[PDB]
TrEMBL record, chains A, B:
The name this protein goes by in its record: 3-oxoacyl-[acyl-carrier-protein] synthase 2
Keywords: Acyltransferase, Fatty acid biosynthesis, Fatty acid metabolism, Lipid biosynthesis, Lipid metabolism, Metal-binding, Transferase
SUPFAM superfamilies listed in its UniProt record: Thiolase-like
Gene coding for it: fabF1
High-level lineage: Bacteria, Pseudomonadati, Pseudomonadota, Gammaproteobacteria, Pseudomonadales
Xref: Gene3D superfamilies: 3.40.47.10
Enzyme Commission code: 2.3.1.179
Superkingdom: Bacteria
Natural source organism: Pseudomonas aeruginosa (strain ATCC 15692 / DSM 22644 / CIP 104116 / JCM 14847 / LMG 12228 / 1C / PRS 101 / PAO1)
Amino acid sequence: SRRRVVITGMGMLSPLGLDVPSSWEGILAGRSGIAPIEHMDLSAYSTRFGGSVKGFNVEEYLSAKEARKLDLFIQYGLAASFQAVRDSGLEVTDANRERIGVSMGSGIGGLTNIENNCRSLFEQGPRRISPFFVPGSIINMVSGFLSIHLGLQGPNYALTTAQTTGTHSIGMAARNIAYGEADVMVAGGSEMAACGLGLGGFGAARALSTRNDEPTRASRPWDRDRDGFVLSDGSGALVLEELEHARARGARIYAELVGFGMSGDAFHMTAPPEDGAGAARCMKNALRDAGLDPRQVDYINAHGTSTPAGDIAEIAAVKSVFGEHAHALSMSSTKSMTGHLLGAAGAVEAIFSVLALRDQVAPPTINLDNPDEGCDLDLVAHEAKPRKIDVALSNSFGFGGTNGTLVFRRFA
Amino acid sequence: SRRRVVITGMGMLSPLGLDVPSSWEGILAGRSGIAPIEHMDLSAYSTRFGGSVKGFNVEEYLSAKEARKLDLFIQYGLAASFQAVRDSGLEVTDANRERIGVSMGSGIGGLTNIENNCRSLFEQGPRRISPFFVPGSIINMVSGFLSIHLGLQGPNYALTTAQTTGTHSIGMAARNIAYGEADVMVAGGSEMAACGLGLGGFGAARALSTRNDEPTRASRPWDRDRDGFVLSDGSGALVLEELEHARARGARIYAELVGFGMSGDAFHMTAPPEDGAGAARCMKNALRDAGLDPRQVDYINAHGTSTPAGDIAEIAAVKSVFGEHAHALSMSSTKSMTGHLLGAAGAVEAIFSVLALRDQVAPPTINLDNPDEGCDLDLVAHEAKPRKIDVALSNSFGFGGTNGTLVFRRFA
Ligand SMILES: CC(=O)Nc1ccc(Cl)c(C(=O)O)c1
Ligand SMILES: [Mg+2]
């Protein structure tokens, strides 16, 4: 006998914009946020482009003193969190602060800060390591700093499930509210892995696109010429709220969160099984959680990373769960435009799924010039598609075979 | 309709032993696991000792080839997880594999591997980064690799809540089972932060004991001469199981998990409030969750890190929650012997709390020569104390003001 959970605020940094409306305008226009990386020298690397956050001004959110302590992934998570809480109009008081929590996560966390501190350590020894190195670099410090700044005393934790983090963070936060452990949660994820270790680590695994001549064409989910994912930075946050709580204060409700599914593939450390069996189990678990028939799904925001094996596994899983209904729904990958924000991917894609419901439009899969063998569903190639969307699903599948699915519905 | 949750298996690597029985024998004997660190040169560091895992043989669990790809924190978490599943006697089958999940977490994760790959990048170049850098370093890969090796297809995730990680991992895993999302979970935490960035980062904060001439006396919770925590390595895992599921297969039940609390302090990024208000809120949440009178608590395994501020905050929190009953319960810090396993602390201390119920004994606080002002409870100084224990609490507090409490009870 679970409580209902609605979305009352959203916030974001992405390669398409410094907030949700600017990002979404880009999504509906089919704009690429992918460009050559300017913030470090990648002349000797096989991939020299990605999705950067452009023109981020941390002093809109933090003092220079505060910002110097915190890794960029924490700055980005706090920017999205602050935006979402402002967007919600929630007032934190002594009467409600024990009922408001935070679960903001990251896949990889503080790589840039670890690189910088490794420079000090190797060239000078331990005495030059920052006294703020540990608290400024660990993944739970978005949740930590947001709770201290806003006086949030509810459940305070952080998920780290690689590329599934943002999806699991939102799902588990929704369960906190549904089961009475909180009335409000700020949830989502953040990532800034564009450093030598990030580009070099994924480069060494040969996982990245190397289309340096045309970065905007590199991310091409389900296209026959795809050659790996595009690495991107950013953050997404949602304010999740118990429905009667939202109604009592006259909150603007964007959508309802009706289902959350999880599964493990138990298959391989990085590759999905060819048939997407774990992804299928995860989507079926999310529909059973929501009490929905597969035929009720109108739109899927795919994981769709532009990897050879991953994109085909997702078609196979959708065909398995939805049967002939797979030919009626629309499915798109916004990673075609944003690239892969890793731990933040599921958070920004949850927001895109909520806005697909608000605006009754399926975002395009750009760059889908020549769909690959078996890639024969409605993948919204090239241009956004206005259509009826009552139910939207968002998928994330990550290293270790860890899967998450969120189901959103229009709220009346 | 919440289901009951019991503990049916446990596993561990600690500074006292390579499994649960050897570690617990050390605990009941008042043995220190703390020694000068041998695995690197710390002559330039202000702290040169800690709790290392001694004589670990990963080849008892994994191929040498597989182990070379994995940070030590992942090797340690897998070892504890394998032990716990073997200890439980559970058989993974097609009929139950979707109902068995894993939530193994870490505070800092793969710092040694990230440091070593950073050294390769800076001194040689990006082509020397390991192709296994990402999957061998990120925190979700204990859950990932355990699910691949055992065939576990249920909920697969990882928490990272700094020094609260193991406690939160066990509590949220118990909620998964209680609410019907799984029937079995393997849950706990692992840590190996003894690298330059670890010892140097905590050293730069002045958080560590610097008692280099007497490492076995350094960790001295509530003692007037304490001067900071002792950094330690290892892992703990529990098999959590729905009660009817355990009974149906004739499982040996160690104890029941009856309560779980979370709270945020919302106070400071690293320091606890002097009055322990967040810790008190957390313990009250956990006792109400368990439907208990506070007078039912017989034993508290304290966080008890040997910090000036933390240890006195915990006395204040216990006096606030328990009133006159604070003088009737026994409370001890096993960190007096193990040191602080950071994200694994809550997992190993949950195991010690369960063994205090099995053996009807309060583990000692060693080194408690001169209890500090106001530290006037039964802190089980020096020697283990046999006594009646029906209910045991385990507390963890961490950076970002994150708090967790587990309540365990004897099972008939
Ligand atoms: C459908 C499915 O299971 N896809 C999947 C799983 C895991 C990863 Cl890591 C990726 C990817 O990033 O391409 C794709
Ligand atoms: Mg000792």
